[PDB]
Amino acid sequence: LTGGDELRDGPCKPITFIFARASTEPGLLGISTGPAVCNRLKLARSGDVACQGVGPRYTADLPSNALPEGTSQAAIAEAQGLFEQAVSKCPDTQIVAGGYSQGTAVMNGAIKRLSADVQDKIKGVVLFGYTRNAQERGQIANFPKDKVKVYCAVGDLVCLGTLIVAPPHFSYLSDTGDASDFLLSQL
In this UniProt entry, which residues are annotated as the site Transition state stabilizer? Predict the structure, then answer.
């Protein structure tokens, strides 16, 4: 595979972007907001970005949205391990991350379990259609609020503590530019 597995495939890059896709999306980065942000970072920092999607253990299946933390424990464990691997395998890399829909639940569940040292390496996180928005009060638990930017479109009910999917939930491509600028700013 060429895209989505750049941390595992190496070589180390100055910037490592870790992303968790939305339910039903195939691959590692998905086919919507993940590639959109990854590519914007690659254009802004030519040759210095490695994009890594959370998979294959995170299957992005629909049923997992109803589990306690909004996703599977396997997906959370996989994501957590990828953050830890980035810091160990590439000591000089700066991490930026993102999630979309169920992917944001993966990000919240994984990052809140990370040590302070690893969290300090994560400069910024963008969450599109944050399914844990209401439950986490617009942030990621046990992580700085200023390092997270949440994109919850008007009418996207998953940000209101429900799993109801409406049209606004698929309007995030229009926010990928702002999200990419945010991540670059945090770096």
Answer: 23, 102
Q: Which residues are catalytic?
A: 101, 156, 169
Number of domains present in the structure of the chain? 1
Structure tokens belonging to residue 4: 């989505």
Reported resolution, Å: 1.8
Q: Quote the domain boundaries for residue 113.
A: 1-187
Beta bridge partners of 122: 95
CATH code at position 72: 3.40.50.1820
Residues 6+ apart with CB under 8 A from 175: 33, 128, 151, 153
> Can you read off the two tokens belonging to residue 10?
């190496």
User: Residue 72 is encoded by which pair of tokens?
Assistant: 């599977």
Q: Please say whether the dihedral angle defined by the alpha carbons of residues 144, 149, 153 and 156, taken in this order, is positive or negative.
A: negative
- What tokens were used for 183? 């991540």
